């Protein structure tokens, strides 16, 4: 089997991407944030505190003939941006782009933090990291990908995110029409539960490539690119007037600037992030100070190849017995 679904930016800045997911019988379609940095599939639901729902589409398990309470199971998760949610668990039928899993753990939110409430376009998250990070207790549950894996033509999924445009998540096959040149594969460590790999270095604009190992995670659920302070300083030093602002919470730059590209290494291959991808617009409406899309990972504890990086590539998440990551230009 295979699946193929279109993923769409939630706003004009590509702050996140939503993908339609069918849950239950008859189908209830929710727009979920596919997140390769977490491993819970959780949804706004009929059980979510009413005051914490503001425009989201909810899952109502009582209206699904295939929903079953997973008795005793609860979940609770906190993300790197400080947001959180929690609740109980149903099993139900879940389909993504024609690919169907029966008995999928659907985590029903009783509580969500303000960040989620305030985002009316995201109805939940679908985690695609390794199942070892799943927060369901007392019986840990498997991700959609893990459940689907054995049925897939090939044990892979791919992320093809658009710049200011729709893209695609495919399950079980590699679309050879979706990228240019070759795919370069690189080793993955699952020791922390993430798609963790080591980039071989970077360049700023037309500058020379610096060979240096940068350990980080491929995370579709993080908007920006978070790298070591040394790297990020080298990038923003090439933008007149750019500075790190503690009041704003990172590097800002004059909205009148033209940003340089940023290149990162995958083995001997290179992925180029165009400068436009690194512009996240005025810090506040009407401001002439703009927010940068490359920020320091210092104090996060890990480097994060988020959407800014990943949308410049066709990315293969290979879930074979020895997992790997593949990157191609497109």
Curated annotation (Swiss-Prot):
It is an enzyme of class 3 (hydrolase). The keyword Plastid does not apply. This is Endothiapepsin. The active site is at 35, 199. Belongs to the peptidase A1 family. It comes from the Eukaryota. Disulfide bonds join 255-290. Transmembrane segments: none annotated. The gene is EAPA. It catalyses: Hydrolysis of proteins with specificity similar to that of pepsin A, prefers hydrophobic residues at P1 and P1', but does not cleave 14-Ala-|-Leu-15 in the B chain of insulin or Z-Glu-Tyr. Clots milk. The chain holds residues 90 to 419 of 419 of the full protein. GO terms for molecular function: aspartic-type endopeptidase activity. GO terms for biological process: proteolysis. Keywords: Aspartyl protease, Disulfide bond, Hydrolase, Protease, Signal, Zymogen. Residues 17-328 form the Peptidase A1 domain. Its EC number is 3.4.23.22.
